[PDB]
Paper text:
We show that this interaction between the orange carotenoid protein (OCP) and its unrelated regulator, the fluorescence recovery protein (FRP), evolved when a precursor of FRP was horizontally acquired by cyanobacteria. Homologues of FRP (termed FRP-like, [name]) can also be found in distantly related bacteria, mainly proteobacteria and acidobacteria, suggesting an origin far beyond cyanobacteria.
To understand the ancestral state of [name] proteins before they were transferred into cyanobacteria, we heterologously expressed, purified and characterized the [name] from one of the few isolated, mesophilic bacteria that feature [name] (PbFRPL): the gamma-proteobacterium [name], a close relative of P. aeruginosa. Circular dichroism spectroscopy of PbFRPL showed the typical all alpha-helical fold, previously found in FRP in solution, and native mass spectrometry confirmed the distinctive dimeric state. We solved PbFRPL’s crystal structure to a resolution of 1.8 Å. In [name], the [name] gene is encoded on its single chromosome, and we did not find any OCP, HCP or CTDH homologues. Our data indicate that despite their extremely similar structures, FRPLs carry out a potentially stress-related function that must be totally unrelated to OCPs and the regulation of photoprotection. [name] from [name], Methylocaldum sp. and Chlorobi sp. had virtually no effect on OCP1’s photo-recovery. In our AlphaFold2 model, phenylalanine 76, lysine 102 and leucine 106 in FRP of Synechocystis sp. PCC 6803 are in contact with OCP1. [name] [name] for instance has the phenylalanine, but features a tyrosine at position 102 and a serine at position 106.
Residue numbers in the entry:
A (entry chain A), B (entry chain A): 1 to 106
Write the structure that this text describes.
């Protein structure tokens, strides 16, 4: 809940970085899911798979919050996870980058 | 909601037939699930897979109702689906078999 003004260039650059990170992570999840599915030998084993999928959807939902008021926190958190690099967001304002860096400290 | 008395031999035979049918159907579902999972190419496609799994769990839950008051209906319904044959339940009472046959008519 950072109420700053975003330029068109800022929303464009943010969209590119958000998408790149989300795409990479979802690819990872899809590969893991498929692996787990293939490894199933007994019907009851579908249960733990559903537990995984639920946890992953919730995780993604919370982490990839595409609301501008939240994007500085999101980016910081992705930088902390090493899914985004600060260089990718250099076009954003210095104010924004400061907030992102602080968010990468939580 | 058929309130009849069941002998030990009757519950034993019923258990054998119930298990045989459930085992076959769950094997089918597991194979289909695995096929669908393997065929997924995009993350969003996990959604329709979850819709399938939910429908299948509900279906099984309702159909394989292991309560003695309901087993004559269950068996009749499985006979109608061709997952059980009446010969498998010949050891049950004639009264029970009559109820099963009527249930196979719905």
């Amino acid at each position: 809940m950072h109420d700053l003004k975003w330029s068109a260039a800022e929303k464009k650059l943010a969209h590119h970085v958000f998408e790149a990170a989300l795409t990479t992570e979802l690819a990872e999840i899809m590969a893991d899911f498929k692996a787990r599915a293939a490894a199933i030998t007994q019907p009851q084993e579908i249960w733990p798979l559903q537990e995984y999928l639920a946890r992953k959807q919730r995780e993604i939902d919370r982490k990839y919050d595409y609301r501008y008021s939240q994007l500085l926190f999101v980016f910081g958190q992705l930088i902390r996870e090493e899914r985004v690099q600060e260089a990718q967001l250099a076009g954003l304002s210095e104010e924004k980058l400061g907030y992102i860096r602080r968010s990468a400290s939580l």
